């Protein structure tokens, strides 16, 4: 800002051409202005989704700033309406064989000795029953003529008969001693496979009460678990089905945010566009007196050229000017001066510009060449030939534009990152649950059930008898009748001299 | 744009009535222009959430936004802080019989043969008794008397003796192979359930192995499973519980997304209306200046009426005028023109309107009727009558409006469905775990615990009996004193002839 | 609105000093105004993202906002191309012994009686055999002599044979009677435990079947159930690593959103600056055509000072003009008054102020002092004093502010709460799944599968002996040489008179 520039150089003593209107043509201009608009309302739904439906149930609650929007382009309160609503949501027997051998003869002098009594064989064959028996007779035969004991013959028969029946006795004894230990092993063998059963039996018992009831725990848990994964399966359906519902709704809430800005934008514009309608009509109003009222003494304003007369009309939603007025037809050329410092002493005009015929400098009206003379009724002076500076720089308003960081220094302030862990479950295929095999046993218990079969005793038949062999009580006198007979040869030895005459029959 | 239109015709010649001021009045206006405003902060927390706390939270995450709109509807970059925060999240006896029956004395004559050897059966009665003790008596009273063998009588007891002992010797051997026969299948039977209960007990052995085993299997099974059902349980409602809290969040930040808008709405008015402020203040450095540095020549500038003085008073945000002017206190309406084309020479006034007192024109002042007489010191002449016509359309900016879509095309653009399929679980209750029944085998192995009990042997008492029958040695010389009494009757005997006296006295 | 304020009273009239031009000094001003704004393409993907890749992918779903703010900075229709994609996703022993004791001799009269039939013992002993053997001796001795039956000692020997056979009968007929009980108990009781093994056998099959048979169940659950975790364990996997997605998505979009906003503000900005730039523009043509093409009459117009001539030229995008003025270098107070009312009589100047040099009232120009006289040609006179009053009350738009509820209160109107229940699945820990405990049983029947081994039968060895005793056919003549012996002592006894001569040998 400095009071001075330079001595006798300044633009203002520039002293350039200038064109000054000579002669005029009478004119006219329509001149038109905007003062009001039609503020319209806007259907937020019509203009975000538009038709799309599966987004014009969500807009809905996104809320009410489709009526904020509309208080914004049209400036009417909306008097909207009250509703309360809320959702709500709840023996010795081969020792007597091995001596005798096969001589008939050796059989009593073979006779062994069991304890305290002497044993022979109970089998007496052909060869010995001649012995014996002739023996017996021999005895008889021998005692009828013999002064003592022919019967000495006899010894042989009457011991051997007692040694027998004595063998018979030892080996009755044992038969039936052995007949004892059969017995008491096979009751105290059946003794023990008594036990054997009741133990088989307790045994297979105690496994059917747990095989049945493992059985039964089996039914249950699959009762259960069955059901358990019917109910998994339930639960991870409404999870799938929610989280797909989910992935639709936060997909078009993005879409549907870019057209709420590009709303938003419209909605701006609009507000823009209305601050100049409002601004066009303020300045209709200097417009529309400065002319019609009055008559203006600018340029250009209120109808290109000079104003002189206006008639205003309507529009629909502005105003329209027929003003009236002139402008040059003919113009010239003109070299002329802001001012012109005389020896130290500015000079410039009053209401006017100089203007230069070739000669000297005369004073004319800026807007039509018609020259006057100098003089201090038509011009100013001044002492200074100094000309003053000044700027004026409109500066438009400059705004704080943001002032955004990049997008991750500005998300890491509050995003908290996330991995939740692998999970797994703990496998279940570690259970061997072995099987059993016991087809061999089975297989031998079958096995033994045939092959018992052939223990069967099948003893050799013996027969008991004992039977009718008993003589009548009416015949039992018939050896009573033999005593008689003994009576009847008593007569014929009645004396024994008959003998005696028929050994004189043996002499002769 | 013509340079022309018509001959004689045209709005700047058609006159009309005009309202000139005839008289004044003095006047005064109080005009008030804005010319500060006092852009108060805002805080978006309470503008979008105000007090529902399950909001404010969620404001945190959005960003800074807050700053940048205050920044806005400021003009102070506010100085913020510095904070470096980050979360982070990590036999023969029958045949005996039927040959015999009951007749007599057949009992030798029916005498079997087994092998090469006779036998008869072991029972003698008291009818074989007597015919064979009679028999050997009778054999020994014939042989006192007879010649030569009256004991041919003996031959039958004598036999029938040996064929019995034969006929025990028989029955005692088979009695004997019998017993051999029995011990040896009940030796072979218990090899054959010593076998068996062997195998019982292999069986009952492994069968508890498994079924111990199994039973083990399924205890380490619902062990595992029952904590897996615990893990399943635990991470679903871990899934629910996320899904609640997304569920809340995809709902609020919607509404919030809506009052954001609301929210720009609200800064988009303050700087629209902070535009028509600094275009106020811009029309007060004019105003101000125009009317108090100078004197305006409008006609309703610096407020409606001709002005002449000012005196300006500050306001807290804004400027107030105290103007000073006139008004026309009379006014009349004159037949008046722009212009008036003469002979084809367009004539108009110099600052000023033609009015027209009854008989010929005036030039007068626009704003206050005092006619002057035409001059062209005071009009203007024109060589041609026609009328050039403008046209000025003040066309305020039309915006290029959004040129959004159907929001379908647009969400298809980058939108994907996604439905999941129905997943299921494979069905467990195929398994039939089937259930044993051994019951009657059970019930079977009890009754033969119960009914081997007959089988028990229960013999006939027999009996042995081999002790107290000993001859004492002192006493054993008792058969010698029977020698001697043989001793006593060898001297009766001691010759024959004393039985010969005994005959002959059977002889008288 | 009031037609009059007092008398003789008001800011019309009060005189006051004001500041009149007196000298003046050559000026120039520099005067700049932007008219042109560079209208930039904004990239909204590096303005709301930057460089944050985990956000660059969602700007593309949130669709063509970037153009519609683009359009809105820059006023050209982008012609922007045309795109089909779309993606898509698809016995009598003991009796006997009682009663006969210690006597050989009590034998005979000792025997007992089993039915019909009488019965010894079947033992001779070395006191009975030498009763019954010198018995029967003396029996063949007495019957030599006596004239009858010394043959009556003869019926115990025949006797006691007959009865021992029988008691050797009865004995062997019950160990027959015994062999046929031990055997059929024998054949009874393996016909009992060949049934207990058919059903030993029947229940370890059964038993065999179902273990197996579940054993075969849990392999199949278990394979199966295995396969069922881990489809369960692929399912969450899913579900968790889609909410974790969603979990990022969801947070990001919201501070993506924010910078929406803060993108908006800009927009909006840059929008209320290029309407000033547009006003200024407007502003410039009045500016440049009332100073280049005229010469303003106004003050501090077109510059500080009073316009005399202009010098447009060109700015960066703008306009700067060299204009060129007058401005007070001295200046002066007067006491000025607009208005002086004289007795009712209301007056004012014309074009000018009132001025006082101390005497009396002049006309002056109101920029510059020069001093005229007061007349009607110079000045307005009223009729009445009374001042008008207007108000001119400039109220800049005031915008129909949002008018939002509490959050709450909105929130409310549509959102849905929702807490899904705490599912829970079946304990399955009440399975017991019992074992089975068989080892006494087991134990026990090795036990007996070791005891029977003591019951094998071991008879006493009896023997068999049927063996070679026989006689030859070459030497069976032997007894017949016998017989040729008894016809040699036939020729000693040819008559018994030698036996006389041996008793008269008896007698001497
Ligand atoms: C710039 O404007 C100037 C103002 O008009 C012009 O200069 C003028 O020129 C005229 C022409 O002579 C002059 O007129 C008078 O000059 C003498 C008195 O000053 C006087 O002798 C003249 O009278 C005689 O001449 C005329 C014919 O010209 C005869 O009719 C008379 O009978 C007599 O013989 C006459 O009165 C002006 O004085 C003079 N003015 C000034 C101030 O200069 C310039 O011509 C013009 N520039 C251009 C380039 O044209
Ligand atoms: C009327 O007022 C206008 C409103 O302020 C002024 O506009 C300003 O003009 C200046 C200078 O041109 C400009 O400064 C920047 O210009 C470059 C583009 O923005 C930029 O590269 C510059 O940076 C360089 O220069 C500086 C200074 O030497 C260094 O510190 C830097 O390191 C770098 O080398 C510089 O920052 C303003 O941006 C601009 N403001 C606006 C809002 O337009 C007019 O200049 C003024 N006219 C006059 C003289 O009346
Ligand atoms: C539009 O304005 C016109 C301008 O004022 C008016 O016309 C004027 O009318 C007057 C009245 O006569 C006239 O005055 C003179 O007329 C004669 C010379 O032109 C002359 O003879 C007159 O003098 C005689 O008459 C007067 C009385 O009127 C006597 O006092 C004298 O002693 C003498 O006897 C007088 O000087 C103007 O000339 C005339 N002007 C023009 C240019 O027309 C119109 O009346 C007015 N329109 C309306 C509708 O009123
Ligand atoms: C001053 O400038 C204004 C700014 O441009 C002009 O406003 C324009 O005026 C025109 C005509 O009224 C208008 O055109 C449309 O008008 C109807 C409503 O928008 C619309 O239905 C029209 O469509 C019909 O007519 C055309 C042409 O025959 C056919 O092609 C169509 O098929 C259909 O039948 C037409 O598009 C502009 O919208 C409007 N623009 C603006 C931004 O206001 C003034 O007309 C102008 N005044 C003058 C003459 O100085
Ligand atoms: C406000 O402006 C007023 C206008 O200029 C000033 O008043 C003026 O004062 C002068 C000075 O006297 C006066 O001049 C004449 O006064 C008489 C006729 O009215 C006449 O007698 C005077 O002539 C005599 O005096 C002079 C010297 O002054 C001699 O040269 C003469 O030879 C003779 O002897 C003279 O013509 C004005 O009339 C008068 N004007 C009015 C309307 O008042 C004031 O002075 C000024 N205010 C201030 C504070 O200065
Ligand atoms: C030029 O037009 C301007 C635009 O309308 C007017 O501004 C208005 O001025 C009034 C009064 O100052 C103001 O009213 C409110 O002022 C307070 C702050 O907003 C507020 O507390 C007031 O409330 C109190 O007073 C009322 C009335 O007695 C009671 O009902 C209330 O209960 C309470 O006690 C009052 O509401 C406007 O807000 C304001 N409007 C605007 C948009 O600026 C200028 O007053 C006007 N100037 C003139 C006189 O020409
Ligand atoms: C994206 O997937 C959506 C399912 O998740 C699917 O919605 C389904 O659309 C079909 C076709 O419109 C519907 O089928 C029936 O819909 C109504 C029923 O009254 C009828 O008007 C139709 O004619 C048709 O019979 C399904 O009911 C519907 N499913 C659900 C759960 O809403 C969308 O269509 C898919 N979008 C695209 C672009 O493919
Ligand atoms: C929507 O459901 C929300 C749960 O999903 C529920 O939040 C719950 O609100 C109750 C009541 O405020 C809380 O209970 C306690 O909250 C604090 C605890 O310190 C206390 O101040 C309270 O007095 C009360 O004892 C629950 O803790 C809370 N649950 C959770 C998980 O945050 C909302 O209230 C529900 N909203 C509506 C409108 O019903
Ligand atoms: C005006 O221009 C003329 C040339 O046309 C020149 O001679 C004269 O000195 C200039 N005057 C001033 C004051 O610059
Ligand atoms: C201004 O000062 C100049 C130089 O002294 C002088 O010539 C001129 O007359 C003065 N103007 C006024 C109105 O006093
Ligand atoms: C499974 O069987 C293998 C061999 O077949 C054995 O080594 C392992 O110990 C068994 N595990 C279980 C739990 O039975
Ligand atoms: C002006 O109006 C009058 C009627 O009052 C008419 O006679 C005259 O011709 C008009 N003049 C023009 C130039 O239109
Ligand atoms: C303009 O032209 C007209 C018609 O020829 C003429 O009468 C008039 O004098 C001219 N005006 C000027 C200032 O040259
Ligand atoms: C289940 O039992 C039915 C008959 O009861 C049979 O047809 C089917 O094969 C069995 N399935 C299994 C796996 O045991
Ligand atoms: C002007 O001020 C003077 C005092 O300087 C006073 O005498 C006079 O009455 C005032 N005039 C008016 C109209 O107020
Ligand atoms: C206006 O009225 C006043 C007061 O009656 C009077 O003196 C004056 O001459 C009138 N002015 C006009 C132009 O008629
Ligand atoms: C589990 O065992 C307990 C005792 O050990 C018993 O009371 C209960 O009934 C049993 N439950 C099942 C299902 O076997």
Request: charged letters at 15%.
């Amino acid at each position: 800002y400095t009071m001075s520039l330079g001595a006798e150089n300044s633009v203002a003593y520039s002293n350039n051409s200038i064109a000054i209107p000579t002669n005029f043509t009478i004119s006219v201009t329509t001149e038109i202005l905007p003062v009001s608009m039609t503020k319209t309302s806007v259907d937020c739904t019509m203009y975000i989704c538009g038709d799309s439906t599966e987004c014009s149930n969500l807009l809905l609650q996104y809320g009410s700033f489709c009526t904020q929007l509309n208080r914004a382009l049209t400036g009417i309160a909306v008097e909207q309406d009250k509703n309360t609503q809320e959702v709500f949501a709840q023996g010795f027997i081969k020792q007597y064989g091995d001596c005798l051998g096969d001589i008939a003869a050796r059989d009593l002098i073979c006779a062994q000795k069991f304890n305290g009594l002497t044993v022979l064989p109970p089998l007496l064959t052909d060869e010995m029953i001649a012995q014996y028996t002739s023996a017996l007779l021999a005895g008889t035969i021998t005692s009828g003529w013999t002064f003592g004991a022919g019967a000495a013959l006899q010894i042989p028969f009457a011991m051997q008969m007692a040694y027998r029946f004595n063998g018979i006795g030892v080996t009755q004894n044992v038969l039936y001693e052995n007949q004892k230990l059969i017995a008491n092993q096979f009751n105290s063998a059946i003794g023990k496979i008594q036990d054997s059963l009741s133990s088989t039996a307790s045994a297979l018992g105690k496994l059917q009460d747990v095989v049945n009831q493992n059985a039964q725990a089996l039914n249950t848990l699959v009762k259960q678990l069955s059901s358990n994964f019917g109910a998994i399966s339930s639960v991870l359906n409404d999870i799938l089905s929610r989280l797909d519902k989910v992935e639709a709704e936060v997909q078009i809430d993005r879409l549907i945010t870019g057209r709420l800005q590009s709303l938003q934008t419209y909605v701006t514009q609009q507000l823009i566009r209305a601050a100049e309608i409002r601004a066009s009509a303020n300045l209709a109003a200097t417009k529309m007196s400065e002319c019609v009222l009055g008559q203006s003494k600018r340029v250009d304003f209120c109808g290109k050229g000079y104003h002189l007369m206006s008639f205003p009309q309507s529009a629909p939603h502005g105003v329209v000017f027929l003003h009236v007025t002139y402008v040059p037809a003919q113009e010239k050329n003109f070299t002329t001066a802001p001012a012109i410092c005389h020896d130290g002493k500015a000079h410039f005009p009053r209401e006017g510009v100089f203007v230069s015929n070739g000669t000297h400098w005369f004073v004319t009206q800026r807007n039509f060449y018609e020259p006057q003379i100098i003089t201090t009724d038509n011009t100013f002076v001044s002492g200074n030939c100094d000309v003053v500076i000044g700027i004026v720089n409109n500066t438009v308003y400059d705004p704080l534009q943001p002032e955004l960081d990049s997008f991750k220094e500005e998300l890491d302030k509050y995003f908290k990152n996330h991995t939740s862990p692998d999970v797994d479950l703990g496998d279940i295929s570690g259970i061997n649950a072995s099987v059993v095999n016991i087809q061999k046993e089975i297989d031998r218990l079958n096995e033994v059930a045939k092959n018992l079969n052939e223990s069967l005793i099948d003893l050799q038949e013996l027969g008991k008898y004992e039977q009718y062999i008993k003589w009548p009580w009416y015949i039992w006198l018939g050896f009573i009748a033999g005593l008689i007979a003994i009576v009847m040869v008593t007569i014929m030895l009645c004396c024994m001299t008959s003998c005696c005459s028929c050994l004189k029959g043996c002499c002769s």
